[PDB]
Amino acid sequence: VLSPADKTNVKAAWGKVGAHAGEYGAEALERMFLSFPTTKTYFPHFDLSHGSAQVKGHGKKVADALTNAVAHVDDMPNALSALSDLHAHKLRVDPVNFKLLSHCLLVTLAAHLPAEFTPAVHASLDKFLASVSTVLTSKYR
């Protein structure tokens, strides 16, 4: 359950991220692939080298999905339904992996938002990404 304060915080952070959303998404993916090599096996057909146009393109899709979640924060299950279907049914993404990408998203925001990434906002973002992850794995429950 995201509190009003959390929603305020998440919205503020996204605001500060602004038009870098896509680039930060690509950076989060690279952090994930390097830090947690097991995750790479979901993208055996991607080139995952630094600077990969495929990682950049995917980072944008991921960022777009998260912003759609922010923009429909009170209706996330519905907003993310197709994505939930895809990740669970087709891709069979191990639920553990959402924690890894969520962490890398936090790390990425932390490395870009010196002022915005306070302990409070960090907490709110964690809850947000946890909430998104819960939806994306819900086709497992």
């Binding site: 490395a111 010196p114 306070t118 302990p119 960090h122």
Partner: protein
């Protein structure tokens, strides 16, 4: 854990830059704020009712310093984390019964704090090296469970 020399370089170089008086308390404070169930183990610290209370809490800063001291010690003995953290494992596992998932959490919060403090300097490869380190420390601290 076996870091490559490149990984060791990434870790060592960054760590020399770390404010050992502050980062520990920042990581612990954030742990308590972000994963509030961890506050269960620190009721003696006093006011933890808000983020500001936690981060400004002198006991949080003081204990965090000891925690970071332990990380530093692990960094000095990467090829024997098990021996290094033996005693702390005994403490957190046998006496405190902290769930080890929480070791992994504190490690990832520390990573977030390093990212916040170092910004772009905390590159994806530097992160990946630090992830190997915090995984290794978590694993060693958890050895008394194995």
């Amino acid at each position: 854990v076996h870091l490559t020399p490149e990984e060791k370089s990434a870790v060592t170089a960054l760590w020399g830059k770390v404010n050992v008086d502050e980062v520990g308390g920042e990581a612990l404070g954030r742990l308590l704020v972000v994963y509030p169930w961890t506050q269960r183990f620190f009721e003696s610290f006093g006011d933890l009712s808000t983020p500001d209370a936690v981060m400004g809490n002198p006991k949080v800063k003081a204990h965090g310093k000891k925690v970071l001291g332990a990380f530093s010690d692990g960094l000095a003995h990467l090829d024997n984390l098990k021996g290094t953290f033996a005693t702390l494992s005994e403490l957190h596992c046998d006496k405190l019964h902290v769930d080890p998932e929480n070791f992994r959490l504190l490690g990832n919060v520390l990573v977030c704090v390093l990212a916040h403090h170092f910004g772009k300097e905390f590159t994806p490869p530097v992160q990946a090296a630090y992830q190997k380190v915090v995984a290794g420390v978590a694993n060693a601290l958890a050895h008394k469970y194995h």
